[PDB]
Each structure stands twice: as structure tokens, then as C-alpha cells.
Design a protein around this ligand. Structure first.
Ligand SMILES: N[C@@H](CCCC[NH3+])C(=O)O
Lengths: 332, 202
């Protein structure tokens, strides 16, 4: 069981990577290949691991191009019996927990936050957990502590307006790679890039803001709200939450491009990687400006609008670079 | 074909920029100021005990810097597009000690006495057990991180030395910092231009 995460990432990619590494799969290939933007109004939840996945499963969407899929489960007991069976079956359970009750987290008995970690061994007194989010921990934990975390009510917390008020619910995540993986050759990388670009450019559905046009409309709606108002507060809370793992995907995708750039010595792939990483860094200006307005009342509409159009422009520059890359990897 | 020729560089001069009047944020705290940390939106801060003494002269990777003479309302510059005057002259490099709330990249403007201005790319990596995404050098890596109510063991806070070139052969007069609340500047040193020529042999 190997700890894996990235500085732009959350427990969502991190736990899935641990599961992927154990079955012999490269997380940068599986999780770094897809790259998108989507937002469904009303979909988000106050969890560190929220990602919009419909019509696919959570892992299926995060691994768009691989037969990787996931299922959510809720254990109905008072103990950890359902988790012992899953381990016995060879499954690696991903547990939904509250940081408030994990002794090894900085938030322990300070702040409520909804979180994911890997369970890898269960005795009768201790649960063995693996959690790569800084500060990474891996080892045994008192079973009462785990059960408090797994069953927490995650009540609304004034010190976490982002990942509180989402009960752990004793729910957990099973993952499986359900068939042969595609050969990650140059043609496949070509198609992966071309599909990401085409999805980014296409006209969104009626019910979902997607891609480049969706991101524009979304950012415009954000900047229209009056700072300080209740609508602006719920809007900025959604912004910080949904954009963590969207920013995460951008940084992961750039790594996927860098890795194949070194593999085949195609500079078009490193140049595109730099464009995609610029989108990742663009999210920082937008996210952090919203985060300080929401939390400390630092209302700066001019900065928020300025980072927003900078993000859109960086996204437009990336897409063009990605198309040159796809051309250099393969003929369409 | 390959041709390599030895060069010689002059002794440049380091101009250490007094930024004490631009300090607007508290990103470092002591065990008795833990609730004043504003490095990020969660109230974290650098451990003061593992950082330099205010006003001391230090060297990171050979580059000299003055540690800020902090007041209780500021120990660094959270970047809001401040304009910084620099001694007029011909320069080669800008050196910043900095960190960012997550990695980001932005622009430093350099203003020259004939009205030309140059947009200069700068990247700053994360304070949270960061890795240098832009090729920065490591300036500090603490053992602990400060939280609003405790000192956290085994969690490094990271600060970076980042380098920004000034290509223009012309007299620079001021710089503009980026407009991004995510970016924190702790010191700023400029390096003068120096002459290079072919050396003795060849
Ligand atoms: N470290 C998380 C905050 C999670 C809530 C506190 N454990 C972040 O950077 O957004």
C-alpha cells in the first residue's frame, strides 16, 4: 500500500492512486489522461472529494479513458465487519471520514472536514489506515477513533465553511479495473488529447456548464454577484470546493504530458504541458481570491474579475498548444 | 559541431531593497501569536523560531537578503500590485524570497526611464510542503507549521528563492509586483549587470 498525492491534489486522486498502484497501474497515466471542466448547478456537496461524475461513476469519470469504475456503499452495523469482508475479498476499502476524529490529522478536535483514506488491515483492536495528504500518515489507529471518524455527523463548523455539514455516514468506496487497459502508445495519447480539446470546445448541454464556453458563463455569473451577500457566500463556497479537484486534474494532466514528452522526446508535448499547467496556476488566482472574500471578507471584485479572464485566456492558449501536440504525436 | 570558449564575468553588485514599508500581511507567527497567521485562508503561518531574525543579513544560495523589520500588522508583502522603487541602474536579475497559497505564476513589470516597460514572468511554488514547479531553489524548509490553535509537528512550511531576468539594456527605475492575493514576498534583492568577455585562452 503506497502513499501517493500531489501538491495541487486532494484525497480524491490520492486514495484512487493507492488503489491503482496496488493493481499494477500507473496513476499518472490513468488519472492524468482526462482533462475537463464541468459544473452542474445544485450537484456539489461540502466534501474534500466532490467531483461531478454523471453519467459515470466517480472513478469512471476521473479515469475517463480506462475500464476503471467505482461503487459507493454504506455499512449498516456498529462495527467494521463489512470492511473485513471487503479486505478478505482482496478489495482495498476507501473510507469516508471526518478529520475531526483522526488523531494523526492536524484538524483533530479542532475542525470538521469530510475526507477520504485507504483502509488496509483490520485487527480486533486497531484499524490500519493510509492517508497521503500532508502530513502523510500510515499505520494502526484505535478502533474507537476510526468508528468516531467513520460515523461522524460532520456538523456545520464555522472554521470550515467548505467541507463541514456532510455526515460521514459510514460510507465507503470500492474500485475495480474491469478489463484490459489500452496500450498507452502515441496514437492513444493523440486521441486522448484530441478528445479533451473537442470536449472543451463544444457547446454545453442545457443542464450543465461544460468546457470553455461553460467556464466563461460560470465565471461571468460569479463576478455578477454582490460581494458580502448570502448568494455570493454560497457561490464562493461552491467555487472553492468544486475547483479543488478540477485544479487537481489540470496539474495531473500536465504531468501526464511532461511524462510522455520525456518518453518520446517530443517537445510539442512539453510545450502543451506548460500551457495546461498555466491553467492549473490560473485556478489559484481565482480560488484564493474567492477564498479570502468568503472567509475573511476581503471583497475584491476587480481582482476576482481579473483572475477570471486570465484563466479563460490561459485555457484558450492551452487548447491551441494541445492541438499542435496531438499533431506531433500522430496523424489524424 | 561543438565549440566551447571560456568566459570571464565581472563582480556584480547586490542592491538589497528595503520593503519594510510595504509589509501588509502576517505569514509568520510565534507560539504566542498563533492566531494571527494569515499565510493562507485557514490561518496558517511559518514558525518564527525556524526563520531568520528580523533585520538580519542572510545568504540563500549565495544571494544576500535583509530579513524584514516586521511590525505586528505585517511581516511580508501579500502581492497587490505594489510599485517598488529600485536604485536606477542596469540590471541582470531579480531575486525574491517568496511562497504562494498553492503554486501560481504571474508578471513582474519593470519600468525603465525612457517609458518602456517589460512584463517579466515569475513563478512561486507552494508554502505547504511544496515542490518547486518552476525550478526555484529552496530558501527555507521548516520542521513545523503553525495553526490557529497549535504547533503542528512533522509538517514542513516551504519558502523559495526565485529568479527573474531583466533582458533590456537600459536603466530600470521601478518594479510592479503581481496582483494576486496568493503570492507572498519576504525579501527582494536585485543584481547589477556585469561585463563578460572571452578569457585568456582562445
Ligand atoms: N488542507 C485543505 C483544508 C482541508 C480542511 C482542513 N483539514 C486545503 O488546503 O484546502
Amino acid at each position: 500500500v503506497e502513499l501517493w498525492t500531489r501538491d495541487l491534489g486532494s484525497c480524491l486522486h490520492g486514495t484512487l492512486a493507492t488503489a491503482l498502484i496496488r493493481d499494477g497501474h500507473d496513476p499518472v497515466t490513468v488519472l492524468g489522461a482526462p482533462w475537463e471542466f464541468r459544473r452542474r448547478p445544485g450537484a456539489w456537496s461540502s466534501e474534500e472529494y466532490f467531483f461531478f461524475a454523471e453519467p459515470d461513476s466517480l472513478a469512471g469519470r476521473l479515469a475517463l479513458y480506462h475500464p476503471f469504475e467505482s461503487t459507493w456503499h454504506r455499512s449498516d452495523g456498529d462495527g467494521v465487519d463489512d470492511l473485513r469482508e471487503a479486505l478478505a475479498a482482496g478489495v482495498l476499502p476507501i473510507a469516508a471520514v471526518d478529520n475531526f476524529h483522526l488523531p494523526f490529522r492536524p484538524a483533530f478536535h479542532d475542525v470538521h472536514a469530510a475526507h477520504l483514506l485507504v483502509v488496509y488491515r483490520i485487527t480486533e483492536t486497531e484499524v490500519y489506515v493510509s492517508d497521503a495528504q500532508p502530513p502523510a500518515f500510515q499505520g494502526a489507529i484505535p478502533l474507537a477513533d476510526f468508528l468516531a471518524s467513520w460515523g461522524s455527523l460532520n456538523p456545520p463548523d464555522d472554521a470550515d465553511v467548505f467541507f463541514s455539514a456532510s455526515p460521514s455516514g459510514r460510507r465507503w468506496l470500492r474500485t475495480r479495473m474491469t478489463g484490459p487497459v489500452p496500450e498507452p502508445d502515441r496514437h492513444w495519447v493523440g486521441r486522448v488529447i484530441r478528445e479533451n480539446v473537442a470536449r472543451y470546445r463544444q457547446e454545453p448541454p442545457a443542464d450543465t456548464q461544460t468546457g470553455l464556453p461553460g467556464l466563461r458563463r460560470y465565471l461571468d455569473e460569479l463576478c455578477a454577484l454582490t460581494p458580502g451577500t448570502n448568494a455570493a457566500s454560497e457561490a464562493l463556497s461552491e467555487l472553492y470546493v468544486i475547483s479543488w479537484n478540477i485544479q487537481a486534474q489540470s496539474g495531473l494532466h500536465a504531468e501526464f504530458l511532461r511524462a510522455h514528452s520525456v518518453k518520446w522526446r517530443i517537445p510539442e508535448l512539453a510545450e502543451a504541458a506548460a500551457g495546461v499547467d498555466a491553467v492549473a496556476h490560473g485556478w489559484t488566482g481565482v480560488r484564493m481570491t474567492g477564498a479570502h472574500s468568503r472567509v475573511w471578507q476581503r471583497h475584491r471584485p476587480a481582482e476576482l474579475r481579473g483572475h477570471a479572464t486570465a484563466l479563460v485566456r490561459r485555457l484558450e492558449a492551452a487548447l491551441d498548444l494541445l492541438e499542435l501536440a496531438a499533431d506531433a504525436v500522430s496523424l489524424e | 559541431r561543438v565549440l566551447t570558449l571560456p568566459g570571464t564575468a565581472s563582480a556584480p553588485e547586490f542592491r538589497l531593497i528595503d520593503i519594510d514599508g510595504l509589509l501588509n500581511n502576517r505569514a509568520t507567527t510565534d507560539v504566542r501569536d498563533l492566531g494571527s497567521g494569515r499565510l493562507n485562508a485557514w490561518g496558517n503561518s511559518f514558525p518564527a523560531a525556524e526563520l531568520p531574525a528580523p533585520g538580519s543579513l542572510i545568504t540563500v544560495a549565495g544571494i544576500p537578503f535583509t530579513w524584514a523589520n516586521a511590525h505586528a500588522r505585517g511581516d511580508n508583502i501579500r502581492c497587490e500590485g505594489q510599485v517598488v522603487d529600485i536604485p536606477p541602474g542596469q540590471y541582470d536579475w531579480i531575486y525574491l524570497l517568496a511562497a504562494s497559497e498553492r503554486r501560481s505564476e504571474d508578471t513582474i513589470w519593470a519600468h525603465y526611464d525612457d517609458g518602456h516597460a517589460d512584463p517579466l514572468r515569475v513563478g512561486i511554488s507552494d508554502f505547504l510542503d511544496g515542490t518547486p514547479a518552476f525550478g526555484e531553489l529552496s530558501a527555507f524548509r521548516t520542521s513545523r507549521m503553525h495553526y490557529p490553535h497549535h504547533v503542528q509537528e512533522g509538517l514542513p512550511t516551504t519558502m523559495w528563492l526565485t529568479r527573474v531576468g531583466m533582458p533590456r539594456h537600459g536603466v530600470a527605475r521601478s518594479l510592479r509586483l503581481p496582483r494576486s492575493v496568493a503570492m507572498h514576498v519576504f525579501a527582494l534583492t536585485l543584481r547589477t549587470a556585469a561585463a563578460v568577455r572571452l578569457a585568456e585562452g582562445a
